[PDB]
Amino acid sequence: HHAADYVLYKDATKPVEDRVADLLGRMTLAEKIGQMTQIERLVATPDVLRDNFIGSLLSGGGSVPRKGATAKEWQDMVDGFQKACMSTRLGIPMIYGIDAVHGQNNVYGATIFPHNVGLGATRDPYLVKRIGEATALEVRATGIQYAFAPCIAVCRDPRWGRCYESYSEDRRIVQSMTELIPGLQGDVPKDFTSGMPFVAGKNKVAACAKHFVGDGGTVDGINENNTIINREGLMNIHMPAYKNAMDKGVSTVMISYSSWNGVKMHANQDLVTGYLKDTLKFKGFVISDWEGIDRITTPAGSDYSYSVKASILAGLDMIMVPNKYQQFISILTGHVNGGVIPMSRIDDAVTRILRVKFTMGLFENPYADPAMAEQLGKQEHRDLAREAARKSLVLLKNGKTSTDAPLLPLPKKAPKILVAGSHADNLGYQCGGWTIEAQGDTGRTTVGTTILEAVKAAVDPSTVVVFAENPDAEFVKSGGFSYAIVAVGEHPYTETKGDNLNLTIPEPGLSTVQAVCGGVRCATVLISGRPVVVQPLLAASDALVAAWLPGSEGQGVTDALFGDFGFTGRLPRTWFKSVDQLPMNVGDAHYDPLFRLGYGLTTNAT
Ligand SMILES: *[C@@H]1O[C@H](CO)[C@@H](O)[C@H](O)[C@H]1NC(C)=O
Ligand SMILES: *[C@@H]1O[C@H](CO)[C@@H](O)[C@H](O)[C@H]1NC(C)=O
Ligand SMILES: *[C@@H]1O[C@H](CO)[C@@H](O)[C@H](O)[C@H]1NC(C)=O
Ligand SMILES: OC[C@H]1O[C@@H](O)[C@H](O)[C@@H](O)[C@@H]1O
């Protein structure tokens, strides 16, 4: 279709499948295996990207051009890598991925939304869609086109260090929150075939349903472990939301480190090819987790030749190496050259990769848009996070006895109030994991409003606010306080570091609540990724709020404390009496919760 140097794959007016086929038929083995390779920015250089025809880059947690980098610094970095990729023979653009799992959370100044467990507490799929939308804009602010989200794990045991990344122990709630997908990617058209990939264009991002499948079903919540459940329960609990994701055009699917009845997901042909591809008709690309193929073996990495064979024969399309690309490419090339992996498998992986890239407009808009940089941390997005934080809060107690005056909502005007606790003025703790680093961090790590800052922004000008992180009982009794707001809870974590068999909050936490509430009527705000042992905190407190990990916008907390809005959140998980009960889920036979799934007290706006 027209000039003498015409190349059909480069013609934006042509159908995606025709462009895919046209380009695939021109590629060498090296160019094909390159597409299948995703590398860390930390090992990327212009020569590495060209010489190995690399398909994809990522940032792992904390993998950033520098601390405090601006949106434009990110764009410049991503465009630098893209320029190298576009200078290859075929000029296939790379796709750049990142964990934007509660906003664009590796980036300084990005809006940080509540983590998924709190979003489950909202029962508000449209709010979740709007968070997807805003997160797409903040990702594209940084020049990035691909988010490793949503995590649609169904966490069945809160001892797991990633339980906060699950919207609920109830698969129906997780299913409902797959609205994140069309928020991130755009709505699919009226005619759409379930399982096809979709992204609307340059203001949206490719999504990723992860981690397939049963990541939240592991024994005793041990991260990356074995999920022991018959096929019926796998399909009834862990699988459903993947079909909702197919229906909404999720572009990619990431494979889990976990095993199912002793078989490593990253080696499971029956589930990855037989089920996801052949039965759900998924036509986007399947990506590994980070050194996920390595972890097929014990020790991990002890037979990388086998890792490559097993994973690629199982049906994985793109491998998150993410460092040893030379070894990955060499070993895979060897296997193809020896007939151990057929060309049909290579061509399928590359067809899927290219399909997503052409569908999302990456060949038309390979570079960043500098007018998008100002989307990062935009006040309108912060307003949305603030609404989400407030809606996520679950009020568990509001009065020690049925005849007490209800403590919440608290008055904005009082002569003197106390804000206390390790979590009252600590932005990093209120954001939790996957914020600036994977494990998260402590203190003022990004731009935001702590609980203390939000209190001061909310109260009448005549109200004196005193902060004391860990006051003793006498300080409180002597201070002339009208009431106290005390905030405590878990420290930031993710993955295996978060696995925890006792689920008791660190001290001083309870001891501060006791000292404060002992002296003055108190609202306790518990910051956690999951239910934790809570009877002792309840016994001391007039009121207590499960605030989960509400993110950067602390004013969401005070919005409900001071009665600007009423409490509406409902537990998205069972609150256990003891960890000896676990696992214990709604619908179980011996169900003896401290608070059942769906529990939540309400207030009315002042
Ligand atoms: C589960 O963890 C146990 C305890 O560390 C470990 O020995 C076992 O190999 C793990 N199993 C799987 C499938 O990952
Ligand atoms: C509970 O578990 C974590 C390790 O997972 C540990 O750091 C913490 O000290 C433990 N708490 C108690 C009460 O043993
Ligand atoms: C709030 O308003 C409702 C209905 O409009 C009322 O019936 C309810 O009891 C009120 N709730 C509280 C906690 O006062
Ligand atoms: O950061 C890249 C990846 O790291 C892995 O450890 C996690 O399991 C994934 O959820 C994440 O996308």
Query: Pick from 4, 38, 20: which is nearest to 90 by CA?
Result: 20
3-state secondary structure of 491: coil
What's the burial of 316, exposed, middle or buried (CB within 10 Å: 0-12/13-18/19+)?
Answer: buried
Strands 208-212 and 146-147: unpaired
Asked if 260 and 271 touch (Cβ cutoff 8 Å), the reply is yes
C-alpha to C-alpha distance for 450 and 41, rounded to whole angstroms: 32
Dist CA 592 CA 569 (whole Å)? 21
Please tell me whether residue 601 adopts helix, strand or coil conformation: strand
The CA distance from 464 to 454, in Å, is 14
337 Cβ contact partners less than 8 Å away, ≥ 6 residues apart = none
Gaps in the chain after residue (C–N beyond 2.5 Å): none
Q: In what order do the strands lie in the sheet with 259-260?
A: 226-227, 259-260, 263-264
In the chain, DSSP finds a helix count (H) and a strand count (E) of 21, 17
- Give the distance (Å) from ligand 2 centre to CA of residue 510: 15
What does the CA dihedral 392, 123, 564, 551 come to, rounded to 10 degrees?
Answer: 30
Q: Is 504 in the pocket of ligand 2 (CB under 6 A)?
A: yes
* Helix, coil or strand: residue 210: strand
State the SS3 of 375-418.
Answer: HCCCHHHHHHHHHHHHHHCEEEEECCCCCCCCCCCCCCCCCEEE
Ligand at shortest distance from the CA of 40: 4
Altogether, the residues listed in the chain come to a count of 606
Q: Measured between alpha carbons, how far is residue 201 from residues 38, 56, 185, 318 in Å?
A: 22, 18, 8, 22
- What is the secondary structure of 228-274 as a DSSP string? ---HHHIIIIISHHHHHHHHTT--EEEEPS-EETTEEGGG-HIIIII
- Tokens 């990110």 sit on residue: 74
Instruction: Give CA–CA dist 115/494, Å, rounded.
Output: 12
d(CA 446, CA 443): 9
Sole residue written with tokens 């005193």? 466
Q: End-to-end alpha-carbon separation of the chain, Å?
A: 67
Q: b vs e for 504-532, b when ≥16 Cβ sit within 10 Å of the residue's Cβ?
A: ebeeebbebbbbbbebbbbbbbbbbbbbb
Q: What is the 3-state secondary structure (H, E, C) of 414-449?
A: CCEEEEECCCCCCHHHHHCCCECECCCCCCCCCCCE
| 602 CA: nearest ligand 3 atom | 13
The bound ligand whose nearest atom lies closest to the alpha carbon of 221 is: 1
Backbone angles phi, psi at 140, to 5 degrees: -65, -25
Rounded Cα gap, residues 339 and 332, in angstroms? 11
Beta carbons within 8 Å of 544's beta carbon, 6+ residues apart? 395, 396, 397, 523, 524, 525, 526, 534, 537, 538
Note the ligand closest to the C-alpha atom of 297: 1
Check if the beta carbon of residue 254 is closer than 8 Å to that of residue 221.
no
Minimal CA–CA distance to 203: which of 189, 188, 184?
A: 184
Please indicate whether residue 380 is annotated as part of the active site.
Answer: no
Q: Which of 133, 289, 294, 425 is catalytic?
A: 289
291 is catalytic: no
- Cβ pair 408, 394 in contact under 8 A: no
The DSSP annotation for 44-74 comes to --HHHHHHTT--EEEE-TT--SSTT--HHHH
Element (H, E) at 465: strand 464-468
Ligand 1 center from residue 596 Cα (angstroms): 31
Nearest residue to 355 via CA among 600, 9, 90, 606: 9
Q: Spell 247-278 as b/e; 16+ CB within 10 A means b.
A: bbbbbbbbbbbbbbeeebbbbbeebbbebbbe
Q: In what order do the strands lie in the sheet with 394-398?
A: 394-398, 543-548, 522-527, 484-489, 416-420, 464-468
Residue nearest to atom 9 of ligand 1 (CA): 225
- Helix axes 343-359 and 16-24, enclosed angle (nearest 10): 140
**Ligand 1 touching residue 225 (CB < 6 A):** yes
Distance CA 195, CA 304 (A): 31
Out of 502, 503, 505, 579, give the residue to mutate to test ligand 2, the one with the largest number of ligand atoms within 8 Å of its CB.
Answer: 502
Instruction: Compute the chain's Rg from CA coordinates.
Output: 25
Tokens at residue 405, please?
């005056």
Query: What residues does 209 pair with on adjacent strands?
Result: 253
Query: CB neighbours of 326 closer than 8 A, spacing ≥ 6?
Result: 52
Ligand 2 contact via 470 beta carbon (within 6 Å): no
Neighbour order of strands in the sheet with 319-320: 146-147, 95-98, 56-59, 37-40, 319-320
Q: Minimum-distance ligand to the CA of 504? A: 2
Nearest protein Cα to ligand 2, atom 1: 502
> What is the CA(604)–ligand 3 centre distance, in A?
6
Cβ atoms of 585 and 148 closer than 8 Å: no
Two structure tokens written together for 292: 């996920």
590 Cβ partners below 8 Å, 6+ apart? 581, 584
Minimal CA–CA distance to 547: which of 363, 423, 444? 423
State whether the beta carbon of 290 lies less than 6 angstroms from ligand 4: yes
Strand 394-398 relative to strand 543-548, pairing: antiparallel
Does ligand 2 come within 6 angstroms of the Cβ of 496?
A: no
Comparing CA positions, the residue from 379, 349, 220 lying closest to residue 277 is: 349
Nearest to 215 by CA among 204, 203, 207, 223: 223
Residue 468's H or E segment, with its range, is: strand 464-468
Separation between Cα atoms, residue 381 and residue 130, nearest integer Å:
9
Compute the distance between CA of residue 233 and CA of residue 474 in angstroms, rounded to an integer.
55
**Ligand 3: residues whose CB is within 6 Å?**
602-604
Q: Within a 10 A sphere around the Cβ of 15, how many other Cβ atoms?
A: 9
Tokens at 533, concatenated: 């042992």
Q: Is the CB of 148 under 6 A from ligand 4?
A: yes
Contacts of 465 (CB under 8 A, 6+ apart): 417, 419, 452, 455, 456, 459
- Closest of 304, 295, 308, 316 to residue 496, by C-alpha: 295
* Cα–Cα distance measured from residue 207 to residue 167, given in angstroms and rounded to the nearest whole number: 17
Amino acid at 354: L
d(CA 537, CA 318): 47
Resolution of this model in Å is 1.9
Q: Is 117 exposed, middle or buried (CB count within 10 Å of its CB: 0-12, 13-18, 19+)?
A: buried
523 and 542 Cβ atoms separated by less than 8 Å: yes
Locate tokens 């100044």: which residue? 109
323 contacts 41 by C-beta, under 8 angstroms: no
Q: Where are the alpha helices (DSSP H) in 520-605?
A: 535-540, 555-561
Contacts of 573 (CB under 8 A, 6+ apart): 117, 120, 155, 158, 163, 168, 169, 530, 531, 597
Closest ligand 2 atom to Cα of 500:
5
Burial (0-12, 13-18, 19+ Cβ within 10 Å), 151: buried
Residues 224, 495, 542, 553: which is the catalytic one? 495
The CA–CA distances, whole Å, from 481 to 378, 463, 467 equal 36, 10, 12
Q: Is the preceding omega at residue 409 within 30 degrees of 0, hence cis?
A: yes
List the 252-255 sheet strands across, edge first.
208-212, 252-255, 285-287
Spell out where 481-538 has E strands: 484-489, 522-527
DSSP string, 129-147: HHHHHHHHHHHHHTT--EE
